[PDB]
Amino acid sequence: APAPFADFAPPVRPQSTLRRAITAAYRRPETECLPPLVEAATQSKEIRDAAASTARKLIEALRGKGVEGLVQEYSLSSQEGVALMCLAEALLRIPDTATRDALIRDKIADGNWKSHLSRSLFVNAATWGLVVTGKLTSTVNDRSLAAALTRLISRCGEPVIRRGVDMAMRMMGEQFVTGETIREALKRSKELEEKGFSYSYDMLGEAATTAADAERYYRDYESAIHAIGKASAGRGIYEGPGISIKLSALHPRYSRAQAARVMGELLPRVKALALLAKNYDIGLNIDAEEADRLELSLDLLEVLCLDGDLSGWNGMGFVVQAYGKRCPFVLDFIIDLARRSGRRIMVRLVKGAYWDAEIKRAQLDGLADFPVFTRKIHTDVSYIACAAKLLAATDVVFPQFATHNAQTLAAIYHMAGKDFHVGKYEFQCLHGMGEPLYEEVVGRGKLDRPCRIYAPVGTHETLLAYLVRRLLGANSSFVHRINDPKVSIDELIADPVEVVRAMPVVGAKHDRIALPAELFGDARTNSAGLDLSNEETLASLTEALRESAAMKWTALPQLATGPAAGETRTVLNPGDHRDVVGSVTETSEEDARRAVRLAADAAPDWAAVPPSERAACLDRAAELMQARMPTLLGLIIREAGKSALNAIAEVREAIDFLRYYAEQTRRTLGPGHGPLGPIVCISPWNFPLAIFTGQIAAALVAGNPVLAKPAEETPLIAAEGVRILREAGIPASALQLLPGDGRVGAALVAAAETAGVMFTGSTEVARLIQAQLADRLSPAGRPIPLIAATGGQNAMIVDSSALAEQVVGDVITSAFDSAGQRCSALRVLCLQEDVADRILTMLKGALHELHIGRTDRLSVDVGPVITSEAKDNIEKHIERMRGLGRKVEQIGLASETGVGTFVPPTIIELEKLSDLQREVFGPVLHVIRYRRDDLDRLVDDVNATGYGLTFGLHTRLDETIAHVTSRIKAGNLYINRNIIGAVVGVQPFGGRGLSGTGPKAGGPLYLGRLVTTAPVPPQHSSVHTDPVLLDFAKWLDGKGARAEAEAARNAGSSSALGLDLELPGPVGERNLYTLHARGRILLVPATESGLYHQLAAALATGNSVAIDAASGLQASLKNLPQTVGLRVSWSKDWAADGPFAGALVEGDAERIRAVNKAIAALPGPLLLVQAASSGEIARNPDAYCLNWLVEEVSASINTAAAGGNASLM
Ligand SMILES: Cc1cc2c(cc1C)N(C[C@H](O)[C@H](O)[C@H](O)COP(=O)(O)OP(=O)(O)OC[C@H]1O[C@@H](n3cnc4c(N)ncnc43)[C@H](O)[C@@H]1O)c1[nH]c(=O)[nH]c(=O)c1N2
Ligand SMILES: NC(=O)c1ccc[n+]([C@@H]2O[C@H](COP(=O)([O-])OP(=O)(O)OC[C@H]3O[C@@H](n4cnc5c(N)ncnc54)[C@H](O)[C@@H]3O)[C@@H](O)[C@H]2O)c1
Ligand SMILES: *C(=O)CC[C@H](N)C(=O)O
Ligand SMILES: [Mg+2]
Question: Which GO terms describe its cellular component (predicted)?
Answer without folding.
Answer: cytoplasmic side of plasma membrane
